[PDB]
Amino acid sequence: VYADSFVIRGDEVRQIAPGQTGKIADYNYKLPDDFTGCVIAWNSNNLD
């Protein structure tokens, strides 16, 4: 179980899903289109 963690600006959380494309999915981190796994995201303005 690889756990991969990073930060992204709120409305870009849509980009992460498998088969998406755009700034994160194109140039930073892409999920495989047959990904088995879970994407966990939560607000961090209280910290970051």
């Binding site: 409305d11 494309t21 755009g22 700034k23």
Partner: protein, 49 residues
């Protein structure tokens, strides 16, 4: 100023080259949902209008 939604402003972009990558790379576009075509390939197509 844009149009109001009831009277949408329509412009024919035609007889011109269009790189859609420079659109899609704009961090402004919170929504860029496409149908029947995928953004990664738009530059491989040409369209009648």
């Amino acid at each position: 100023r844009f149009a109001s939604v009831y009277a949408w402003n329509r412009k024919r972009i035609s007889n011109c080259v269009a790189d859609y990558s420079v659109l899609y790379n704009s961090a402004s576009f919170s929504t860029f949902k496409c149908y029947g075509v995928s953004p990664t390939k738009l530059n491989d197509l040409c369209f009648t209008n």
